[PDB]
Amino acid sequence: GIVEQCCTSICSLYQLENYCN
Amino acid sequence: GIVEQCCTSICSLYQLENYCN
Amino acid sequence: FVNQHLCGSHLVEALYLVCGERGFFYTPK
Amino acid sequence: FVNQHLCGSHLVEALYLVCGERGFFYTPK
Numbered sequence A, B: 001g002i003v004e005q006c007c008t009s010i011c012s013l014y015q016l017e018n019y020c021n
Numbered sequence C, D: 001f002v003n004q005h006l007c008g009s010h011l012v013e014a015l016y017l018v019c020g021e022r023g024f025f026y027t028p029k
Ligand SMILES: [Cl-]
Pocket: C006, C007
């Protein structure tokens, strides 16, 4: 999930875009 | 939607719970 | 609309605290 | 895990910025 990916390493805005609708 | 309901009036905790998964 | 977006920023934070492990869905207009 | 809870608070704020009008679903573990 997003917590696993982005709280263990820094997620850029482009990486966070994958979780958008 | 949540913006219509809760940005025009103060929504309680239970009203916000309607937008949980 | 800037004012609408500012309210939405607080909308997401409140849902995160209220919903907890369930999570939430947000959709602007 | 308090730090996990704190991290999720910034995550939902970040999602609200990038997704914009598209919206998003927040589904933690
Ligand atoms: Cl504000």
